[PDB]
From a paper:
RecF is a multifunctional protein involved in recombinant DNA repair, homologous genetic recombination, and DNA replication. Similar to RecR and RecO, RecF is a recombination mediator protein (RMP) in the RecFOR pathway for ssDNA gap repair. RecF contains the conserved Walker A motif, Walker B motif and signature motif of ABC-ATPase that exhibits ATP-dependent dimerization; additionally, the signature motif residues interact with the ATP bound to the opposite molecule. To gain insight into the mechanism of ABC-ATPase RecF, we solved the crystal structures of TTERecF, TTERecF-ATP, and TTERecF-ATPɤS.
The results of size-exclusion chromatography demonstrated that in solution, TTERecF (42 KDa) forms a monomer, whereas TTERecF-ATP (84 KDa) and TTERecF-ATPɤS (84 KDa) form a dimer. The structure of TTERecF consisted of two domains. Domain II contained six α-helices (αB, αC, αD, αE, αF, and αG) and two β-sheets (β7 and β8), in which the signature motif was the loop between β8 and αG. Domain II is similar to Lobe II subdomain of Rad50 and SMC protein; however, in the Rad50 and SMC proteins, helices corresponding to αD and αE extended into a long coiled-coil region, which was absent in TTERecF. Comparison of the structures of the ATP-free TTERecF and one monomer of the ATP-bound TTERecF dimer showed that the two monomers were similar. The root mean square deviation (r.m.s.d) was 1.015 Å under Cα trace superimposition. Notably, two structures differed in terms of their conservative Walker A motif and Walker B motif. In ATP-free TTERecF, the last turn (residues 35–38) of the helix αA in the Walker A motif occupied the ATP binding site, whereas in the binding of ATP with TTERecF, the last turn was flipped by 180° relative to the ATP-free TTERecF to create a space for ATP to further interact with TTERecF. Moreover, the helix αH of Walker B motif moved by 4 Å relative to the ATP-free TTERecF. The KD values of the TTERecF monomer interacting with the 21mer ssDNA and dsDNA were 576 nM and 1.63 µM, respectively, however, the TTERecF-ATP dimer binding 21mer ssDNA and dsDNA showed KD values of 16 nM and 6.2 nM, respectively.
Numbering used by the authors: -1 to 365
């Protein structure tokens, strides 16, 4: 039984009026003339998956202008639940309150997995086009939805990384800190090796899944190069990678003290998408990049289902309007057995099993 959002209630959320909405199976077409309105609804849905705004927005920005809180409640059907309640509340205080079936979660990260979605947007092309930062963050979020252990390791890794970076400054002003520096190096190498091993594993699946879609769509060839920070290309034996990280951290101490940051580790790494053997960021055409962005999300979807045994809900934020007919048809074919939410400016273009009109932030069914 696939994931299915039966209902969402939004209160003081961005520009949406207070309302409870009920949805259907298959394609939920949401059309309207407002920008914020449509994608704000998608933002509220995606929030129940991730515990954050997909736009990258801070929580205080999600509260309705001049209000003191927002609140979102979804009801979801999944493999093991007829109807799970997920609640996300934020008070301008600065505390998120998140509950699943009435139990408050200790940390936001705990939300991950109760409600699976994959969100498509035209912005996904930036994952192809931009720097390592954008691709690490995409990669980290994809793996974390599947793998709680990886999420745990990344949290600790990033915590140790900032502790180390601030210690570098203390070691520069005063001296000393040699002991905490060893302790941090050891921890970075330990967490780093596990992060690298899991990343390598995911990217191998990404490569296999993405090459199939690309071959299907444009008959083009896909390769992925993972340049990891251990410089290894083996990534079986964790202790070998851990040792390579540790030695590298030791060898780069002079450079680290000059810049007051940490030059080696997975927080610096990237992966390279090759299209017909050429670097997709600097060589490929825009059409190719766009196609690659689509294959990227389709793969995400495929790996997510395969790994969790659950079939996610699909969010498509304004991704249909600039497509030609053959690409629309392809994408629609691929959403076949999912619940999906497709935002559009038009009612006619893609039909949809249920159609909703949004205006002045009220969503009404049929039109």
């Amino acid at each position: 039984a696939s994931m299915y959002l039966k209902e969402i209630f939004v209160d003081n959320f961005r520009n949406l009026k207070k309302q409870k909405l009920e949805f259907c199976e298959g394609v939920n077409l949401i059309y309207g003339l407002n920008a914020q309105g449509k994608s704000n609804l998608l933002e509220a849905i995606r929030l129940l998956s991730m515990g954050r705004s997909f736009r990258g927005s801070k929580m205080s920005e999600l509260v309705k202008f001049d209000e003191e809180y927002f609140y979102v409640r979804g009801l979801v059907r999944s493999a093991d639940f007829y109807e799970k309640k997920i609640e996300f509340g934020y008070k301008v205080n600065g505390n998120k309150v998140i509950k699943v079936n009435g139990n408050k979660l200790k940390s936001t990260g705990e939300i991950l997995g109760h409600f699976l979605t994959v969100i498509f947007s035209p912005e996904d092309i930036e994952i192809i086009k931009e720097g390592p930062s954008r691709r690490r963050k995409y990669l980290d979020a994809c793996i974390s939805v599947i793998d709680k252990n990886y999420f745990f390791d990344l949290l600790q890794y990033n915590k140790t990384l900032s502790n180390r970076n601030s210690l570098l400054k203390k070691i520069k002003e005063e001296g000393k800190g040699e002991d905490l520096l060893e302790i941090f190096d050891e921890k970075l190498a330990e967490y780093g090796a596990r992060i690298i091993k899991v990343r390598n594993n995911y990217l191998e699946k990404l490569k296999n899944s993405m090459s199939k879609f690309l071959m299907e769509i444009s008959n083009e060839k896909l390769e992925i190069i993972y340049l990891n920070s251990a410089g290894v290309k083996e990534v079986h034996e964790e202790n070998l990678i851990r040792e390579k990280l540790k030695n590298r951290l030791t060898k780069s101490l002079t450079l680290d003290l000059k810049y007051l940051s940490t030059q080696v580790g997975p927080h610096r790494e990237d992966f390279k998408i090759l299209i017909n053997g050429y670097d997709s960021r600097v060589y490929s055409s825009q059409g190719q990049k766009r196609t690659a962005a689509l294959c990227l999300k389709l793969s995400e979807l495929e790996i997510l289902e395969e790994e969790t045994g659950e079939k996610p809900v699909l969010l498509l934020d304004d991704v249909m309007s600039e497509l030609d007919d053959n690409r629309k048809k392809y994408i629609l074919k691929k959403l076949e057995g999912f619940q999906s939410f497709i935002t559009h400016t038009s009612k006619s273009d893609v039909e949809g099993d249920c159609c909703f009109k949004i205006y002045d932030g009220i969503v009404d069914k049929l039109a």
